[PDB]
């Protein structure tokens, strides 16, 4: 029946539960794991600095995910082991599937010694398998860059398991490259996608050295709240500076000058 | 103390405040009436009459009062009663004062007269006086009350030459004003901040006069501040006994009796009482009291009253209605007068075709207000704070020329204009307070303030005051308006923010002080006089008669709460407090209690921008705010859109102030009334909160958090966000475009990149080309280099260059701009270094030099960051990266010799009974270092070099080369240099025993005196000199043998070559290598230092063996050292001092009780004050004169020699203290009272850790840092000033041990343990300081082309180091084709620098040759700038004013610093001369020293002890005076050559060339020169010519005085000049021409020159000059040094033929009234 009876809606917006949510990330890197011996020896022995890793999970979202291209070198006399010495964060914006970065590659002098590792990821669920988007984008990314070489690029996931961060290093086989960079179906099934397409390399956590970041010259790289600027093509170059968390103020200029109109 | 009970401060608290009625019942005055009405009901009181003048009352007329003060009084013709009655108490009488007269009296004159009593103390007689001396604060309620008085004091007493201004916002370092200014106005609480901050740069010790305005707040919720204020000046009294006068003005009101012994009131002198029968304007008083409970009809029914009363007075009298908001008054103007309409009574406020209709409608038409034009032409008004400036005064304007008829304002009217009205109507008194979050009563004050206004003293005959309020609320405002209402204290509610503000400053440190303190409140004489109503039974007044107990449980309950909240650390059985930096922040920042501790719980390094929102909401100054129903519509609509999330619900009144602060940032305005009034109070509070919240942050290296608090303090200041284009900073500039740009995304960091045309194209606009361009440029923006410098391989020397990249105006910069220097690693989550950065205007151009320290380890970071952020400017910031990856570390300090196990070393080892006897009466054997080197230094030649720390006995390794010298020579020629000038004469003293008085050698002390230091290095066989004392004899090398023909030459403490004067050390040394490598056989060298980690460097440099290398570290001291090194939090330095007090005696206690104790402190005041600080706390645990191991009555034997106050008390009690201030004979008795153990506690100044004869057992270093007066910051000690004060805790012979305990603050505590448990590296910075050096080395051809310049850097220590760490001077490769292209440079732009001075010549880019002001500079030791300037300056007529002027603008006098307390005694002194200055500007190190030069020529005594900065001075003024003589007389000037001659003598006798030439005999009187009146005495050698038995009968002195009057003739250069042209014959014009001229003296060699007010003892030098009349061409001159008989060849060039007469002068350089004159003629053919 009614007609008896008022009542008005009130706004409720994506972003202020995730916002809260990430003001509290900094508690999960005072537990993070790394997963070990499943038949993973690859021959390469990749090592993680703690300093960068605890930051690149604070900078994150929970359900969106943010990716940073790896750079590291090898010890003096050992060149299976590959030490991240570098995470470079490009302008991007993502889903909880997958992220979306430009076809340009990291190009800096700080950089230019480095060899490229591949890149690392944070996914909003641990997942046995690795993600048939990250085979098709790690793929494509071969494909247009011969500088990342399947036996020497790896792909690191950082899983967001309730209370603490797990982390798995996997890298791309023969066979998953040339599936990868043919891929159009990004479902969580596509065709092809076969667990062969992809091994598992083996991590390891250190404090003994440290790492650094490099972010944009001009802008930030969070781009969620002004994915309509973010171009596949866009270009861009890079400083030394580390950098900000997700919800930064410099990262959503809509939610602060659209409240300040009338 | 006695068992205590903790009591509860809410339940004692008045919760009425200023509401409070005391008084139970109020009696009205005879014929008061009151009616009934429509459910209200009114109270009239009639005005009262003028009481008759009974006593002896006149009317004092201006013209009686005294002269000076009449000036004040400009427009008045005579004063009122009360002034009348008060002028003899206010202007003849320093009597604390209290004044209450109803308001209108006329109290403002009496407090004027008050402050011209003090103006007329500081008075000199050029009729413009000294300011400097004095200052008065008057302490107003309002702060339009405080604008208004500014500007009426400042023109009344303009013709005074005073300021008085009002201080500015907040101006922590634009406190320029107070200093400025002698007249401060301000509010108490401002008055209370300022104080609070209590760091003794400030002026608050200058406060002569303070005036208490409207005393009666004391009853206001604001009363406390006034009783803090006065608590603290009057207690302050007794901790000084310099009496500060306090002046209270009040309102007729009771307990004034109360009031005036709360201000040390004398009531038969200083209390004078008049009731309000004294008002000038009798007020008939009426009171409407509403009963009607519902809102809307109480709404109305007053609306009804108004129109009532108005409609008695339209047309008869002007009516003043005020209301309590700015939205009210024109609502009540309105409903007044659209209800007339309904009635048509308009017509009456008007006289329709009147003089006064036409001008109220012709302003209404230009009065660009439209709630104003509506009701102007009308008769009505409104006024308020929230429209333009100059339409109130429109509004003003109209009604005080009787134009308006119905004025509606506010509060703020009735404060800060003089506008008064027949009749006031005060529209309800309930006013909404967002402090207390519920609608209230009106303050006191503004009720008395505005129905103060009611009648026109003028032309009223009287005055009609009505008031509206609620029934219930009428016996209260009849007693507040009939002297019924008393005055009571609201003080136990604030007792515990205002303890820990007296904690905080160090005036209360204990119960027992707080309890002293509390007994100075108006709290504590009101529960004296009236104990129930303070709830204080008589069950406890008389078993505690002045309230002890009572006091002291308040005082125990405020601790605890201080304690909980950890403000405070309150010990319960000592009742000691001590001090916090969170109750320190609390304090200076105005912060209650409570919040400061919500701040320490929540406030977390991974804190993000929404949680510090909510630490923000939860501040205990919103503690009242609510969430009403009718709000929480409007504010959930804002919380759907807030772009920081709030995580509490709506209803938690948290949510409600962090949406209202969001809002504030955003500029929305909002409908609720209570919401605007709410967030007003939330963000005129957030200034402040937030700022604390970042002192906080900051101070504990959160990055991150500091980074988002100071973005948080900017955004509410500019109320905007980051996101938002910062060029809406600019006020002049418009919303317009900076949305054109924001709309457009697009990085404001790239427009710099554009140009005019071209930004504009951006935004779409070819209109306003230049000015975004123009605003962009002006935004201020900084570019960062960095010189990284290793010290080690774990601490980092960093020199920071600011190039400011902007332009400044100051329209939009002002006078300075705030920067923030953050130093961040690698995560960019610590601040590692941090410190406070001020861009001056007038350096606004200049590039800027930061150094400081930053610690690294050896898995070498990727980077660091360096941040300079705006203090105050929005996205203002410039980060640069440091990368570590091409940082060349250093490697690792070699380990030092290992200590051999030898056995000790017998004194019998020398066998020589004449050495032996030296050493066998102090000590059995030599300590285990002595051992090691003896074979090396005692039965070698090869150079050694002993590196042990201070204490180690290193002054004996000396002398074991000094006694090998005499054995294989009985002539022996050792010259030992030691860096400091203590140092000299300490060693000088215990070297004149050892070897001259009982060895029978020679030993000297040079002197900085040419004439004097070459003498004695020829016959001394051991001279002590100091670097630059020895630099001047050692350039000359090649022209002087005794210079090269030394045995031995010992530098001691050669690890100072690091230091400032490092490079002079180090210039001498590797000189002493070149001479003795050229010369025929080496010359010795030993070196001692302390313990080097590069010692192997300087072994090396000084070419020491490694067998002979002694490099030890120090843990080989003989005397083990214990050291403690305990960090203090806290970053205000005066606050921090504090909190070092009791420690430093609780170290006392532990580390020494009983042997001798030595503390160090920063400064020559804080002597004295830890002095007493000691005393008392050994005092408070009752062991007084523990420190004192002699007996009492044996002390006055040498106490009574001493001229200070507290150095005889606390002697007395075991403790002595030593400052620069006390006299040399005053120090010796202190020093050996301390060596003798009779006092246990000697307290040192930093100043004077090099020059102390005394060691003790435990040494204590009170802080690291003193303040540079010049620089206005604080600098740390350097290193080697603490390894000086640590090496004084060793007594070889006495203590097993020796301890020493270093408090610092936190920041500090890593680097001293790096550099004092290991070795110190030292570098070098002779590459600073090449300029002088190298010209010395043209002058003497020991450089001649740019290739040798180069040979000569290689023979210094400044070269061995720059392989050893090349980035510490800037290179980036130790490869040898990179060390000659440094080495290169550094030649090339030397000796271009050089060259471009005209110093030296340069032919073919390859050849140097030294020009005449080169070889002047070379010669005397002076700064190749120095003698620039003194040829731009000089001139053939300069004269005496023009040299002194030249010589004080020298390089060597812009180091001594200035005293801007001083500032007045420098501007008379600039007239106290006889000769005339142009120039302002007395800061100037130059112009300061310019009247100095003249101050000692007049001899004026007696400059405290800114005596000794004239004796140094006159150190340097010789050199500086003989320069021009060379540089004048070079150029053929003959006035200002002669004139410079003479002055030299004039600054040796300390007199002019006017006064006479008897001054110089001793005991010569200024008065007495005129005692030679007429009887042909004005030359000394008038003296000698009278009879002994005559002689005496003049002069009227004594027959010891006498004695010094003969010592000087017979020392007065007595002499005969004989002169003779050679060949005077044949004469060629062109050919060799020759004068000889033999001056033969008659006996002399007695001793120097007779000179007591020069500090030095010269030589008598002499000129020999020839000339020509004063054409100004001087011909021949010749300096030599006379001894008995000498002659002197002066040859020159004949000038064409004729007949030219010449002059010869005989001048001297210290004493006047001996410069003959000869005349001759020349016959040239
Ligand atoms: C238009 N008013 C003036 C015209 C000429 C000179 C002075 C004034 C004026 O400003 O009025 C002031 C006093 O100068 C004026 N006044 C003071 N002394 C005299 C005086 N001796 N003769 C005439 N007017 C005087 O009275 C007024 C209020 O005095 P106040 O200091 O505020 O009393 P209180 O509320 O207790 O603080
Ligand atoms: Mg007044
Ligand atoms: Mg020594």
């Known amino acids: 029946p009614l007609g008896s009876m008022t009542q008005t809606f009130s706004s409720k917006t994506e972003w202020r539960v995730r916002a809260i949510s990430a003001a509290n990330l900094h508690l999960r890197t005072n537990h993070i794991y790394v997963s070990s011996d499943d038949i993973k020896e690859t021959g390469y022995t990749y090592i993680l600095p703690k300093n960068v890793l605890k930051k690149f999970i604070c900078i994150s979202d929970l359900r969106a995910q943010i990716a940073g291209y790896l750079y590291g070198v090898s010890p003096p006399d050992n060149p299976q082991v590959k030490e991240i010495r570098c995470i470079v964060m490009v302008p991007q914006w993502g889903t909880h599937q997958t992220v979306h970065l430009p076809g340009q590659l990291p190009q800096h002098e700080y950089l230019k010694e480095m060899e490229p590792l591949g890149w690392i990821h944070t996914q909003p669920n641990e997942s046995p398998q690795l993600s048939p988007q990250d085979v098709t984008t790690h793929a494509k990314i071969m494909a247009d860059n011969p500088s990342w070489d399947g036996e020497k690029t790896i792909i690191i996931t950082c899983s967001f398991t309730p209370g603490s961060c797990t982390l798995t290093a996997y890298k791309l086989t023969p066979s998953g490259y040339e599936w990868g960079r043919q891929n159009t179906d990004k479902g969580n099934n596509p065709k092809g996608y076969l667990p062969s397409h992809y091994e598992r390399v083996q991590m390891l956590l250190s404090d003994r050295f440290l790492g650094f970041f490099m972010v944009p010259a001009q802008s930030s790289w969070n781009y969620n709240f002004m994915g309509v600027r973010h171009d596949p093509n866009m270009k861009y170059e890079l400083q030394l500076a580390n950098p900000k968390e997700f919800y930064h103020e410099v990262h959503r200029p809509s939610h602060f000058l659209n409240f300040a109109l009338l | 103390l006695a068992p205590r009970q903790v009591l509860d401060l809410e339940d004692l608290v008045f919760t009425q405040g200023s509401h409070f009625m005391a008084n139970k019942r109020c009696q009205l005055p005879d014929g008061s009436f009151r009616r009934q009405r429509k459910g209200y009901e009114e109270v009239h009181v009639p005005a009262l009459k003028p009481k008759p003048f009974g006593s002896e009352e006149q009317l004092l007329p201006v013209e009686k009062l005294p002269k000076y003060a009449q000036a004040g009084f400009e427009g008045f013709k005579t004063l009122n009663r009360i002034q009348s009655k008060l002028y003899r108490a206010a202007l003849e009488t320093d009597e604390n004062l209290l004044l209450c007269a109803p308001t209108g009296a006329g109290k403002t004159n009496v407090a004027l007269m008050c402050m011209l009593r003090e103006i007329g103390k500081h008075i000199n007689m050029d009729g413009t006086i000294n300011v400097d001396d004095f200052k008065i604060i008057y302490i107003a309620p309002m702060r339009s009350l405080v604008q208004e008085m500014v500007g009426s004091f400042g023109k009344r007493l303009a013709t005074y030459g005073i300021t008085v201004a009002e201080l500015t916002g907040d101006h922590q370092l634009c406190k320029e004003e107070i200093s400025a200014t002698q007249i401060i106005v301000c509010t108490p609480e401002k008055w209370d901040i300022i104080t609070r901050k209590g760091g003794e740069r400030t002026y608050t010790q200058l406060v002569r006069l303070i005036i208490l305005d409207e005393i009666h707040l004391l009853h206001d919720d604001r009363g406390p501040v006034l009783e803090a204020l006065v608590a603290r000046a009057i207690r302050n009294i007794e901790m000084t006994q310099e009496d500060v006068r306090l002046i209270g003005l009040s309102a007729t009101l009771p307990n004034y009796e109360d009031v005036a012994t709360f201000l040390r009131v004398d009531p038969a002198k200083g209390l004078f009482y008049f009731d309000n029968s004294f008002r000038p304007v009798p007020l008939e008083q009426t009171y409407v009291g509403i009963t009607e409970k519902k809102a809307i009809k109480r709404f109305q029914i007053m609306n009804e009253i108004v129109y009532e009363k108005i409609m008695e007075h339209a047309g008869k009298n002007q009516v003043l209605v005020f209301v309590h908001s700015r939205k009210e008054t024109g609502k009540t103007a309105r409903a007044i007068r659209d209800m007339c309409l309904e009635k048509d009574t308009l017509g009456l406020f008007l006289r329709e075709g009147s003089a006064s209709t036409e001008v109220l409608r012709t302003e209404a038409e230009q009065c660009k207000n439209l709630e104003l034009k509506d009701l102007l032409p009308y008769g009505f008004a409104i006024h308020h704070a929230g429209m333009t400036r100059v339409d109130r005064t429109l509004v003003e304007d109209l009604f005080a020329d009787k134009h308006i008829q119905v004025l509606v304002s506010t509060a703020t009217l009735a404060w800060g204009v003089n506008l008064p009205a027949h009749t006031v109507i005060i529209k309800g008194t309930q006013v909404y307070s967002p402090e207390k979050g519920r609608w209230t009563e009106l303050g006191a004050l503004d009720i008395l303030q505005m129905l103060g206004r009611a009648g026109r003293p003028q032309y009223d005959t009287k005055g009609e005051g009505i008031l509206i309020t609620s029934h219930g609320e009428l016996q209260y405002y009849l007693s507040l308006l009939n002297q019924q209402l008393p005055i009571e204290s609201q003080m136990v509610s604030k007792l515990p923010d205002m303890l820990n503000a007296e904690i905080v400053l160090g005036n209360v440190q204990n119960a027992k002080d707080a309890v002293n303190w509390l007994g100075y409140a108006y709290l504590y004489i009101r529960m004296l006089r009236s104990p129930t109503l303070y709830g204080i039974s008589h069950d406890d007044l008389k078993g505690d008669p002045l309230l002890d107990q009572r006091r002291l449980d308040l005082v125990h309950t405020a601790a605890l709460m201080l304690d909980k909240n950890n403000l405070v650390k309150y010990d ?1154």
Request: hydrophobic share 40%; charged share 25%.
């Open chain 2, 572 to 1725: 319960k059985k000592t009742g000691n407090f001590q001090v916090t930096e969170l109750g320190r922040i609390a304090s200076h920042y105005y912060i209650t209690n409570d919040t400061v501790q919500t701040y320490n719980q929540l406030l977390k390094p991974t804190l993000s921008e929404i949680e510090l929102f909510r630490v923000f909401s939860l501040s205990s100054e919103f503690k009242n705010i609510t969430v009403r129903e009718e709000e929480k519509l409007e504010l959930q609509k804002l919380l759907e859109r807030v772009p920081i999330p709030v995580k509490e619900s709506i209803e938690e009144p948290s949510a409600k102030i962090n949406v209202l602060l969001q809002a504030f940032i955003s500029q929305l305005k909002l409908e609720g009334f209570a919401l605007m009034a709410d967030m007003v109070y939330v963000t005129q509070s957030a200034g402040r909160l937030m700022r604390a919240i970042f002192e906080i942050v900051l101070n504990r290296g959160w990055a991150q958090l500091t980074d988002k608090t100071l973005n948080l303090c900017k955004m509410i200041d500019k109320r905007m966000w980051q996101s938002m284009c910062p060029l809406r900073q600019f006020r002049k500039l418009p919303e317009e475009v900076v949305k054109k740009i924001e709309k457009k995304n697009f990085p404001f960091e790239r427009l710099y990149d554009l140009n005019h045309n071209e930004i504009g194209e951006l935004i779409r606009m070819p209109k306003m080309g230049k000015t975004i361009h123009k605003y962009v440029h002006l935004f201020p923006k900084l570019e960062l280099s960095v010189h990284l410098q290793p010290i080690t391989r774990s601490t980092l020397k960093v020199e920071l260059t600011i190039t400011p990249d902007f332009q400044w105006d100051e329209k939009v910069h002002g006078s300075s701009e705030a920067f923030w220097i953050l130093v961040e690693d690698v995560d960019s989550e610590v601040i590692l270094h941090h410190e406070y950065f001020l861009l001056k205007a007038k350096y606004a151009q200049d590039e800027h030099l930061i150094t400081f320290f930053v610690p690294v380890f050896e898995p070498l970071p990727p980077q660091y960051f360096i941040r300079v952020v705006s203090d105050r400017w929005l996205s203002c910031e410039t980060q640069l990266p440091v990368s570590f990856r091409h940082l060349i570390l250093p490697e690792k300090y070699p380990p030092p010799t290992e200590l051999l196990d030898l056995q000790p070393l017998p004194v019998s080892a020398l066998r020589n009974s004449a050495f032996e006897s030296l050493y066998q009466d102090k000590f059995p054997f030599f300590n285990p270092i002595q051992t090691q080197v003896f074979n090396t230094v005692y039965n070698s030649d090869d150079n050694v070099f002993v590196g042990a720390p201070t204490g180690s006995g290193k002054t004996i390794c000396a002398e074991f080369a000094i006694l090998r010298m005499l054995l294989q020579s009985s002539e022996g020629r050792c010259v030992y240099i030691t860096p400091m000038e203590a140092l000299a004469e300490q060693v000088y003293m215990d070297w004149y025993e050892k070897f001259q008085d009982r060895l029978n050698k020679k030993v000297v002390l040079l002197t900085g005196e040419t004439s004097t230091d070459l003498k004695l290095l020829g016959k001394g066989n051991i001279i002590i000199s100091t670097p630059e004392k020895w630099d001047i004899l050692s350039r000359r090398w090649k022209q002087r043998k005794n210079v090269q023909n030394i045995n031995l030459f010992v530098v001691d403490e050669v690890h100072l070559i690091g230091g400032e004067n490092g490079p002079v050390l180090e210039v001498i040394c590797s000189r002493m290598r070149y001479i003795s490598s050229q010369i025929e056989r080496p010359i010795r060298i030993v070196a001692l230092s302390s313990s080097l980690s590069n010692a192997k460097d300087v072994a090396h440099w000084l070419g020491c063996s490694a067998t002979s290398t002694f490099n030890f570290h120090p843990n080989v001291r003989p005397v083990p050292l214990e050291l403690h090194i305990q960090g203090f939090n806290i970053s205000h330095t005066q606050t921090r001092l504090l909190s070092m007090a009791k420690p430093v005696y609780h170290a006392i206690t532990k580390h020494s009780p009983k042997k001798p104790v030595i503390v160090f402190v920063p400064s020559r005041k804080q002597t004295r004050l830890t002095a007493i600080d000691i005393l008392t706390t050994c005092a408070a645990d009752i062991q007084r004169q523990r420190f004192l191991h002699c007996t009492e009555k044996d002390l006055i034997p040498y106490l009574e020699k001493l001229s200070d106050s507290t150095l005889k008390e606390t002697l007395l009690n075991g403790v002595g203290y030593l400052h620069e201030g006390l006299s040399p004979m005053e120090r010796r008795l202190v020093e050996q009272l301390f060596s003798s153990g009779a006092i246990q506690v000697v307290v040192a100044s930093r100043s004077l850790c090099w020059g102390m004869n005394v060691a003790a057992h435990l040494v204590i270093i009170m802080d690291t840092q003193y303040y540079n007066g010049k620089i206005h910051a604080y600098v740390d000690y350097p290193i080697y000033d603490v390894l000086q004060m640590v090496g004084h805790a060793n007594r070889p012979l006495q203590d097993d041990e020796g301890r020493c305990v270093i408090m610092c603050q936190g920041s500090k505590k890593d680097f001293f343990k790096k550099f004092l448990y290991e070795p110190l590296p030292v570098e070098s910075h002779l590459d600073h300081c090449m300029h002088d050096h190298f010209n010395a080395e043209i002058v003497t051809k020991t450089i001649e082309n740019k290739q040798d310049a180069v040979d000569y850097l290689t023979w210094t220590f400044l070269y061995r180091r720059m392989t050893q760490n090349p980035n510490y001077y800037n290179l980036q490769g130790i490869s040898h084709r990179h060390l000659s292209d440094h080495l290169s440079e550094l030649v090339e732009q030397t000796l271009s620098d050089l060259e471009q001075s005209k110093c030296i010549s340069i032919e073919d880019e390859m050849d140097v040759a030294p020009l005449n002001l080169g070889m002047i500079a070379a010669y005397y030791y002076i700064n190749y700038t120095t003698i620039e300037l003194f040829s731009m300056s000089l001139n053939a007529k300069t004269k005496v004013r023009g040299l002194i002027e030249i010589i004080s603008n020298a390089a060597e006098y812009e180091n001594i610093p200035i005293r801007h307390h001083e500032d007045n005694l420098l501007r008379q002194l600039a007239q106290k001369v006889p000769h005339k200055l142009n120039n302002p500007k007395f800061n100037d190190p130059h112009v300061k020293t310019n009247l100095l030069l003249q101050a000692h020529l007049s001899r004026m005594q007696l400059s405290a002890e800114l005596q000794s900065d004239t004796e140094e001075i006159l150190s340097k003024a010789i050199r500086l005076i003989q320069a021009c003589v060379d540089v004048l007389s070079s150029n053929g000037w003959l006035s200002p050559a002669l004139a410079a001659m003479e002055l030299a003598q004039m600054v040796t006798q300390a007199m002019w060339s006017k006064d006479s030439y008897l001054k110089q005999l001793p005991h010569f009187t200024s008065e007495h020169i005129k005692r030679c009146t007429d009887k042909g005495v004005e030359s000394v050698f008038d003296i000698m010519e009278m009879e002994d038995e005559e002689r005496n009968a003049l002069l009227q002195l004594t027959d010891s005085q006498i004695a010094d009057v003969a010592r000087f003739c017979n020392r007065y250069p007595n002499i005969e000049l004989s002169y003779e042209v050679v060949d005077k014959d044949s004469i060629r014009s062109g050919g060799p021409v020759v004068v000889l001229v033999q001056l033969e003296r008659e006996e002399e060699v007695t001793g120097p020159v007779i000179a007591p007010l020069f500090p030095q003892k010269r030589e008598e030098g002499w000129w020999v000059v020839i000339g020509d009349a004063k054409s100004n061409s001087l011909i021949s001159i010749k300096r030599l040094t006379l001894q008995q008989k000498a002659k002197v060849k002066l040859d020159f060039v004949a000038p064409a033929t004729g007949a030219h007469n010449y002059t010869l002068y005989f001048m001297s350089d210290a004493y006047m009234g001996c410069d003959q004159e000869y005349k001759f003629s020349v016959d040239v053919k």
